[PDB]
């Protein structure tokens, strides 16, 4: 069992759980791993994260008032690293209609990442970050379509200067 | 709106259950028998317990895999099947994965102050995930996989003889 190659360019939607708030938040997701840029649209904000630059933008969907700020965090792609240990492979659904998926744990320096990806074509289904086994942040992805249909989603409005 | 699917009421597979108090995921095998309202779960290493929940008899047993000490205590709360109640509000329909390798699923919220929200398959109504949340805190959530219908040998639900003597 060798890690697959997740698509580095796709659009879909996500449900993100945070333990601090303890909540799930649904949003659309534009993931561009080639340009290391990602934009999420709340389903009330829109966020545009440009990692090649040092900047992220937070936009009121109604107001367009834009707050720009240094990104701080380093880039972490939505794929399974080569040095990640294989944990399990299971099937979601059941007999007459199933996905086979696999689960991987990178354990990046006691913070550990654990991601579940589809087996043959490797769309991301879920990603979970956990500190000392206390699940800090988890996200599920669905309706994935490869590539970006309109890259203007990553260009900030003129409100952000 | 669409009409709820009726999930199979007898199947066995595996689960990972996340609990907000501990904040942890726990993997285990699961034998779900909704017809006899009995369910048995077997902890997986990834203090290793086995739980047998018999709702018709109102009794639950936790049995411990290493030593087989069984503790029997009365089942407090009522039975709730792994299906979508009829008065569930429909939330969304999704696709997991991508082209040629995917499943279409739907998410339902019954909201039986407590809210239940579970996502089940569209075409065959296999359960994929169950979530219980109090006032927007995720309290509990469990994901199911490797489901095969029916129960292979119902003896999975008979407690060990250590459990008969227990109090």
Residue numbers in the entry:
A (entry chain B): 39 to 81, 91 to 156, 160 to 211
B (entry chain A): 38 to 83, 90 to 155, 160 to 214
Sentences from the paper on this structure:
We solved the deglycosylated form by Se-Met SAD phasing and used this structure to solve the glycosylated form by molecular replacement. Deglycosylated EPDR1 crystallized in a different packing arrangement with two independent homodimers per asymmetric unit. All three of the crystallographically independent EPDR1 homodimers (one dimer from crystals of the glycosylated protein, and two dimers from crystals of the deglycosylated protein) are similar to each other with Cα RSMDs less than 0.6 Å, indicating little variability within the chains and across the homodimer interface. The main difference between the structures from the two crystal forms is that no ligands were observed within the pockets in any of the deglycosylated structures, and we refer to the deglycosylated structures as apo-EPDR1. In addition to the empty ligand pockets, the loops at the mouth of the groove of apo-EPDR1 had weaker electron density. This is reflected in the higher atomic displacement parameters for loops L6 and L7, while L9, L4 and the C-terminal half of L12 (the latter two are linked by a disulfide bond between residues C88 and C222) could not be traced at all. We suggest that the ridge that lines the opening to the ligand groove is dynamic and flexible in apo-EPDR1 and becomes more ordered upon the binding of a ligand.
